Nucleic acid binder design. Structure first.
Ligand SMILES: *C(=O)c1cnc2ccccc2n1
Ligand SMILES: *C(=O)c1cnc2ccccc2n1
Ligand SMILES: *C(=O)c1cnc2ccccc2n1
Ligand SMILES: *C(=O)c1cnc2ccccc2n1
Ligand SMILES: [Mg+2]
Ligand SMILES: [Mg+2]
Lengths: 8, 8
DNA sequence: CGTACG
DNA sequence: CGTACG
């Protein structure tokens, strides 16, 4: 759920 | 994440 | 690095 | 009730 590189 | 009634 | 429902 | 990444 975080999007630091993927945002899912 | 489960969709038993919303599916999110 | 943790968000997302009826 | 539990899922979703590079
Ligand atoms: C977001 O909160 C989140 C949490 N755990 C994960 C595991 C696998 C891929 C994506 C994820 N996203
Ligand atoms: C994004 O592409 C990405 C990849 N690996 C990580 C590891 C831990 C924290 C955040 C990350 N973000
Ligand atoms: C799915 O796995 C999941 C987990 N917890 C939640 C909390 C709030 C809304 C949606 C949710 N979805
Ligand atoms: C779906 O609409 C819905 C509503 N509340 C719940 C509570 C517990 C398990 C599954 C649920 N599904
Ligand atoms: Mg985890
Ligand atoms: Mg929970």
């Amino acid at each position: 759920x975080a999007x630091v590189x993927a945002x899912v």
